[PDB]
Amino acid sequence: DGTMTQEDISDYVAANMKDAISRTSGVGDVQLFGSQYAMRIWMNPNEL
Amino acid sequence: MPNFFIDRPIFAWVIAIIIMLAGGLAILKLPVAQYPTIAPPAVTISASYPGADAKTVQDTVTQVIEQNMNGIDNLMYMSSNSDSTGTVQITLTFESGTDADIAQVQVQNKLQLAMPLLPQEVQQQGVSVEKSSSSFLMVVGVINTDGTMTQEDISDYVAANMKDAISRTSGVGDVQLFGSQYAMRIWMNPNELNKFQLTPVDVITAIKAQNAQVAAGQLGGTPPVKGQQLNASIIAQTRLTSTEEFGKILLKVNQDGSRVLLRDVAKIELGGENYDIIAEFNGQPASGLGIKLATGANALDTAAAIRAELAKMEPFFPSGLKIVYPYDTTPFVKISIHEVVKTLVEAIILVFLVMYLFLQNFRATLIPTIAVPVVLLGTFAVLAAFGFSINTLTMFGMVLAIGLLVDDAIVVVENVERVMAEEGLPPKEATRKSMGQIQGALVGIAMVLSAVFVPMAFFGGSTGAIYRQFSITIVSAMALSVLVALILTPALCATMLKPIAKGDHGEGKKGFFGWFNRMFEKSTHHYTDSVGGILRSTGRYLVLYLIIVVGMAYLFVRLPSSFLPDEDQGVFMTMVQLPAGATQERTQKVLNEVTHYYLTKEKNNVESVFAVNGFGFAPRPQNTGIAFVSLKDWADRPGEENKVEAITMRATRAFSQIKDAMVFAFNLPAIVELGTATGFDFELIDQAGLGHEKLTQARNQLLAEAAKHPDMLTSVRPNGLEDTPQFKIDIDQEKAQALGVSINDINTTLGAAWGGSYVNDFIDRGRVKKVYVMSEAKYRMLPDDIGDWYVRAADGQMVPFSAFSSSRWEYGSPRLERYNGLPSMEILGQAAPGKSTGEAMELMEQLASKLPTGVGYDWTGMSYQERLSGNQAPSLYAISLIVVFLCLAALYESWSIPFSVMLVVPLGVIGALLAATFRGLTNDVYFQVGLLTTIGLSAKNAILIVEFAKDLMDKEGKGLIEATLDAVRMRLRPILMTSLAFILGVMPLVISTGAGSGAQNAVGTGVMGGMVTATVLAIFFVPVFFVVVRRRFS
């Protein structure tokens, strides 16, 4: 329905899906094809 | 083999003695337990954040560890609590049969990745990983009978001298101190700190600087100069050892040269690390050790190892200090097992007497009496080989086995006596002849009977291991019984039996035996004359048999079904739960009332009460208490009203009157890790980051809807705590920046004063212990005390907290729960009378679907195994029924004749159901295994009746009726000999009182009831079955 980007989907998988899958019976290592959200502080050196 | 050992009786004896030798050695070495290990391994991660609220703990520790718990094999689920006591506990529960060592290693491997991310205060408190039961194996209480040591003194001694050695003992998974080890307590005064222009930061800095252990090297240390003669260690600062030394710590030298010592700004005493846990023993000041059994470790061996370690310590105790034993779960195991061992001996003695009534000579009576213990002892050696333990179920396997063992021996002995009486052959000839005509059937019967007991060794999960104990014990005994019946029993029959003349049935004897022999010989004629008349009617007994089968069916569905009875184990516990925010003083007030009740209203039943303030199943300061109750011996508590169930019922009823307190006494179950018969364990999940407040509303919505269905659901309540008022304080960053006050100084001053701060270690009488700084009680009691604490700015001005802070009252969780890494709220409850747990759960699912968006659920603990698998009974007993038929078909070389034997099953079931029904017992494990035993003997009796009849028809060429009448006539004596011996042998169990009588009563009742109907009905019905079946099929 085009309401979530690559980044939104990646965060949701990382925050609500990955951990439960990683603890599922018979599951070894789990690789996320994306990144969970962090609070990004993008600094401007001129303003600093 | 018989013919070999008839000529070599000393060989036969040697084999029997070696079997008993192996059994005796097995008994001395075999592990002893109440039940086999069926509880899933649980690894618990415990962490502590001093002075932290529930949310701080969760969001800096719990969530960080939980997110690192991955790549962990055989994990069923993960649950965690984050308390406002500054504590988190994450329990990872693993699949049954998981290696607890690897489970711990894997959890520990993942924890070490999370460790560097955890706060430094949490790391320094220690983050333990343990593999133990949730419940206590025992409590080791310590008191001072001379009253020379306070609760605090005893707690410190136990911590410093006893706890460590007990913690390192093999089998001890966890040790809980009921009290605190001493720490150097620096009780800070804010008025004095402000006077000398100092803060908790200055105090902490001064302690770290002046309570230091300095590595200073050596004089003439390597590499040295040429010609060095002196070499000595340089000793600089060492740890302080006393309040005096901490007291004279120099904080600052004033401008006029005067000194500010730590004792000038703080009270310095040797006090506890915490002041949360306070224990009493029968009202007296006490400490102790709450010991938990390591996963899979033997309870009795661990208990013995603990007592051995305590025995080492006692000689070096101070005057008056004494060990008391207020709670132990092991004595009952020891005594209950020993009560079953006693009924084995009693059963063998009663077997001997019933044998002497029929054989009427001492030597002959010993042949069946020797066979039983030889096989039973042998069975212990087979359990040892297969890695089984001596437990309640394996021990009751031995008791039920006796019936099958004596029958094997009696069948052999009686048949020799019958041959000797009919022909007049000497013992040695009659033995050879007798063995020749039954040795085939004995081997064949054991394979038919194995098809009855083997199937229930293939039950799955929790129930599986329970039934597997009986299967292997009984099947092993039967196998040895046949091997003993082919080696020893024949050898003894040839050497020990007295020659009987042809036609002599002991009717010529004078005395009791003279009369009994003539009574039985007449009774045998009355019997055959009765059967002879029954065989003419036939049809009216087929219809009477259908009445017994329908009678059985009705009783089976009416009889309530359970699993394992609740045993009185001479101990129980009482929970004291006040609402969160309730003080330590309020909880002691309620604990006193509970202690008072047991010491006054239950003098005759209760021996000791060990009450702990600020403890439940784990530490929980102020609002929680627990009481460990030890009862007097079962012998001194006669009747039902003096047993644990009635005592805890009366206690719970009395304590219901207590205001602002959930106080109840509870008997800890059979399998503690099964829970209760019709209880459910429900988890409400936050699936969409809704938050605590929204999840509470969803929980309240579910509890309100569950309250409208008392027809289905009963006592549906939260397992956690309710939100409580909390003092929200806001540090104004701009104002703190403006006054030149650092946020690190603010946070340290607030945390250290109001929460306490673990600075460093010191040496108290040779032992490393903690140094804590904190506010003196009186300056951290009132909200207005906040403003009495001053922080020094960069310019040197002392600034009160009131200058740079604002505060308000708000509500928040004292205990935040998470399930499988998501915020959760555990909801307990049970099915209403007459309703199954499945229906109760099915409705809870229905109600849970109606909750707001983002609220899911899950089942945990007792409700987890419930839903995954339940009731596979018809499947295994259908195969059993088929395989028994096939085995009988092979034995008789007939597809039809097996039915004549299989139609006896209901004759023993009706009597068991009647017995259990009319004693108010339930269709449980002990009833089921006792019923399979009853079916075994009754079927075995029928097999030998049908075998003797078919033999006379095939070999001697007799008619159907004549042969059937000859069969039952010949098989009467041995059937009754066995029936009486076993029925009378299980008498001690039926009338049993004392430790484990619940299990004994349950076993004996079903067997005695089943045996009497099976005995009286079979002797009249088996001859009908054979005659009727033989006629329908040519």
Ligand SMILES: CCCCCCCCCCCCO[C@@H]1O[C@H](CO)[C@@H](O[C@H]2O[C@H](CO)[C@@H](O)[C@H](O)[C@H]2O)[C@H](O)[C@H]1O
């Ligand atoms: C047919 C030829 C093969 C023959 C087989 C010979 C080997 C079998 C015997 C060796 C196994 C028995 O091993 C033995 O076990 C018994 C218990 O059962 C122990 O017996 C002893 O234990 C402790 C000492 O540890 C004593 O205080 C105690 O009085 C005694 O019961 C012995 O300490 C142990 O050495």
Ligand SMILES: CCCCCCCCCCCCO[C@@H]1O[C@H](CO)[C@@H](O[C@H]2O[C@H](CO)[C@@H](O)[C@H](O)[C@H]2O)[C@H](O)[C@H]1O
């Ligand atoms: C005749 C039919 C057979 C009847 C059933 C056989 C008896 C079954 C007993 C079950 C309980 C046995 O439990 C077992 O007892 C023996 C002693 O007897 C103990 O063995 C003991 O040996 C010696 C005996 O003096 C002690 O010094 C020692 O402390 C201890 O090791 C085992 O540590 C215990 O596990």
Ligand SMILES: CCCCCCCCCCCCO[C@@H]1O[C@H](CO)[C@@H](O[C@H]2O[C@H](CO)[C@@H](O)[C@H](O)[C@H]2O)[C@H](O)[C@H]1O
């Ligand atoms: C997965 C493994 C598969 C194998 C399963 C095998 C299970 C079947 C076991 C059934 C038990 C049969 O038991 C066996 O019956 C035969 C019947 O001929 C008896 O055999 C006896 O029967 C009569 C005697 O009048 C004679 O025909 C025969 O010469 C004699 O040996 C054996 O003495 C008995 O031991």
Ligand SMILES: CCCCCCCCCCCCO[C@@H]1O[C@H](CO)[C@@H](O[C@H]2O[C@H](CO)[C@@H](O)[C@H](O)[C@H]2O)[C@H](O)[C@H]1O
């Ligand atoms: C609800 C279940 C009740 C369980 C009862 C189980 C059986 C009870 C013990 C067996 C007693 C039966 O008693 C026995 O009955 C048969 C048939 O009626 C009698 O048989 C008698 O009557 C029949 C027909 O009337 C004649 O063909 C026969 O010649 C004559 O002897 C026996 O003389 C008697 O000894």
Ligand SMILES: CCCCCCCCCCCC
């Ligand atoms: C430990 C059991 C000892 C049993 C001794 C039996 C004696 C049998 C005597 C045989 C003489 C031929």
Ligand SMILES: CCCCCCCCCCCC
């Ligand atoms: C857990 C699945 C059941 C496995 C247990 C099988 C036990 C074998 C019985 C041996 C019969 C003598």
Ligand SMILES: CCCCCCCCCC
């Ligand atoms: C201590 C572990 C269990 C020991 C096995 C039993 C030995 C049997 C000796 C015949």
Ligand SMILES: CCCCCCCCCC
């Ligand atoms: C599974 C048992 C099969 C029974 C065989 C039927 C025999 C019929 C022979 C006429």
Ligand SMILES: CCCCCC
């Ligand atoms: C066989 C041990 C128990 C002793 C009698 C109470």
Ligand SMILES: CCCCCC
């Ligand atoms: C475990 C289901 C009930 C058992 C009936 C014998």
